[PDB]
Design a protein around this ligand. Sequence first.
Ligand SMILES: *Cc1c(COP(=O)(O)O)cnc(C)c1O
Ligand SMILES: *Cc1c(COP(=O)(O)O)cnc(C)c1O
Lengths: 411, 411
Amino acid sequence: AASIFAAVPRAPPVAVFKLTADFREDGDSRKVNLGVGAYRTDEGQPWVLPVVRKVEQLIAGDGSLNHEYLPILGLPEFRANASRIALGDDSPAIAQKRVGSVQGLGGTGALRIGAEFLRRWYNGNNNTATPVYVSSPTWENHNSVFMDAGFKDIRTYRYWDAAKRGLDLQGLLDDMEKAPEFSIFILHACAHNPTGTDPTPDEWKQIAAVMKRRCLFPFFDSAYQGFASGSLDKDAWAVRYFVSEGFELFCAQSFSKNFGLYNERVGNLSVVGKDEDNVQRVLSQMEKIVRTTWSNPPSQGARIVATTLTSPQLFAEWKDNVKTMADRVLLMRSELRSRLESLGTPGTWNHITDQIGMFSFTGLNPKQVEYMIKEKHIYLMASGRINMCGLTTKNLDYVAKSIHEAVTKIQ
Amino acid sequence: AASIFAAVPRAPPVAVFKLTADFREDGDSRKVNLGVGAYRTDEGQPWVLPVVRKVEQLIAGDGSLNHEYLPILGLPEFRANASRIALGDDSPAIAQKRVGSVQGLGGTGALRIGAEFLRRWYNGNNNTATPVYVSSPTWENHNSVFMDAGFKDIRTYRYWDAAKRGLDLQGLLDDMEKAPEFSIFILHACAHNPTGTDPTPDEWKQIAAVMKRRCLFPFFDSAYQGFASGSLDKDAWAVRYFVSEGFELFCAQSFSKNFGLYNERVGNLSVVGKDEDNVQRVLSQMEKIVRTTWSNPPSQGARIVATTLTSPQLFAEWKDNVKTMADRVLLMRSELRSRLESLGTPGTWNHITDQIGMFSFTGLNPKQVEYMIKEKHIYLMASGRINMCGLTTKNLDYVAKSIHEAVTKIQ
Ligand SMILES: *Cc1c(COP(=O)(O)O)cnc(C)c1O
Ligand SMILES: *Cc1c(COP(=O)(O)O)cnc(C)c1O
C-alpha cells in the first residue's frame, strides 16, 4: 500500500561533510577548502605520514598476521600504549594500575561508549537527568552524541567571548559554580574546536579547583594531542594535571588527526578510576556496550598506531611528522595575520596568532561566509570557523584579500 | 574516597569470546576449539583467503590512496556492490533504484543502525512498543542489540523442534499468525545460527504469505551468504524472494565469515523500499544515526571487498575460495554422521547432514557440555552448538569419541 517509510522526513546532510562534497564538485580554479579539520600540505594535498606509509608496508609483508576477531575491548598493545601517550609513562595512575582503556571507532566512538556507560551507571542507575555541559560554542557532534546516548538535559558553559575575541574565564567559572554536583562536563584537552582558544595552565588550575569542590565529572575530548604545539607532553598538560589532582575521569582520544588516520577510525577511551577493581568493573560493563554497537573493533588502524608507539625509531619519526604539521600551521597563522593587517582589515587579528591547533574563529557573520563561498569559492563553516591547514603559500594572498572584501563590502 | 564507580557491578564476559580466551589459556594437549563461528583449515589454523591476500598486496602498492574520511554512509563502490551481491545483478529493486545501502561495522553494526532507525521512525514516532521477534533459539546478540536500541518487547517465534531435530514450521507459522500487525521479525537468511536448520524454499513461501497478510516486517540477518551451500546465489534465494514479493525490508549483511575479514568489521545494511524517494529519506536519517555512533566507517575491509567484487577475475577467485570453505564443512558433516553412526552411538543423525553452514545443533545437554568441556577439553557453546570448522581429519575420532562418552557416561 503506502510505503512504511512514507512519513519519514528528509534530514539535511551533516554540514561539515557536505561542505567537502560541495568543494570537490566546484570547478572554479581558485577554490579553497577551509572546512573540515584535516591536514593539508603546502601543495594543498592530503598527507599520509611517512611513518604511516612505512608501517603499512611492514604490515603488508608480515605473512604471520591473520584476520581473527580482536577482543571486544580491542588490541591490547594498542590500548596500553595509547593510554601511555595520553597520560605519560610516569603517570601515577598507570603505576597504580588505575587506568583502563577501550578501543573506540575514532574519537567519536570513544565518546559514544563513554556516554552510554555514564547514562547507565553514573550518579544513579539509568539516570538520564544528570546534566551534561558543553562549551559555547563546541564541536556540533558533542550535543548529538550525548542526546543519542540518552541524556535529556544538555547545557552550555560560557567560553568564547565574541567582544574580546578570547576566553570568557569568569563566565565559565560562574557557570561551573552553579552547576549541580555530579554534572558532566565535556572538556577539550587542547586545540579547542571550533574556536582554537584554550585555557592557559594557570586557568586550568582554577577550573580544576571548582570541579573538585563540586564533584563535577571531567570528560575530556582529546583529538589533537601533538597537533596543538608540536609536543605530545605540552598538549596533554591539562589531562595529566587532573589525574595528578586525583580526579576520576574519562579521556576520549582520537588518532585521526595526529596520525592522519581519519579513515581507519582509531580512538581510545581511557578510564581513570580510584583503584584497579573499580576500573575493571567499569571495563566489564563497557564490553557489554561495545558488543551491541560494533561487536569488536577493526584492526588496521590500531595495528599501525601500536607498531609506531612500541618501536623507538618509529616513535621518533612519528614525533617528527607531528611537529612538521604543527609548525606548518604556526607559519600559516603568522602569515594570514600579517596580510590581514597590511591590507588594513577592520578589527583586531591577534586572535589569529593567539589561537591554537587547526582552527581559527574568524568572527565573520553568516552573510559574510556566504559571500566567501558563493563568490570567492572559499569553503568554510557557517560559524566562520576556518581550518588553517587549508592555507598554503600559494593561496594566502587570495584568502586574505577575500576576508578583507567580506568584512569591508558585506560589513 | 569512594569512587564514583564503587557500586558498578562486575558483568559476566561475552560468552563466545570468553570461550576462546579460556581455550587459549588451557594447557591440555587434546584442546579442541569448537566455539566461535570462525573458519579453520584442516590443520586447525585460521585461513586468510588467497584473494584477500592478493588484494591486500594490491592496496599496499597503490600510492594514490589516501586516508581522508570516507562519506558517513560508506565507500560508494562498496555500498553498491555489496547490495548487488545480496539481491542479485538482475534485481528489479536495483533497477528501479529502490535499494539503499549503508556501510556498517560488521553485521552487528548494520543490525544496530537498522534497529536505531526503526525505533525512531517505523510504526509511529519513537514507538518503543513495537514487538520484536527472534527465533527460538537465536544468536544471543539479537536480543541485546534491539534492547540497546530502545525496544521493550522482545518475543520469540518457535523454530527448533528438539523432538524432531528440525524446524517446527507449524509452531513458527502459528506464532506469526498471532503476532500483532507491524511486528518486526529477525530472520536468518540462511545457515541459521545456532541450529544450522533452515526452511526450504517452499517453507519460506509459506512464511512469506503470512508476513505479507499480517504486514510483518522482515529484518534479514545475512551473515553466511555463500556458506550454507557454497553458492552465493542459492544462499540469497529467500531474501530475493521477499524482494520479488514486493516487501519493503532490511538486510544486514556481514562479510566477516565469507571473506574471512572478521577483524576488519565489514558489513552492509541494505534497505529495500517502495520507491527511490522513500529509500533516499530513510538514508538521510541513517546518516544522522551513524554520525553519533562511529561518525564514518573504516576503509580497509570495505576496500578489499569492493576491489574483489569489481574485478571479474578477483570475483571468480573469491567464489572459489568460498566454495573451498563450504566443501570442507560438508566433508566434516558427512564424516561426523559416519563416526557417530558407524561407531554405535544412539539416535538419528540425518540432522548433521541436513543442517547447513558452520553450526550443528548437537543435543548435548548442559552437563554433557560441561563433561565435554571440563574433562575432555573440547570448548563449545553451552547450547550444544558445535562449530563444524573445528573438526579435522586429525581431531575427528577424538571428538566423536568424546561425544560418545558424554552420551554414554555423563548423561
Ligand atoms: C575530530 C574530532 C573528534 C572526532 O574524531 P574522529 O576520530 O574523527 O571520530 C571529536 N572531537 C573533536 C573536538 C574533534 O576535533
Ligand atoms: C557473525 C554473525 C553476525 C554479526 O557478524 P559480525 O560481522 O561479526 O558483526 C550476526 N548474525 C549472525 C547470525 C552471525 O552469525
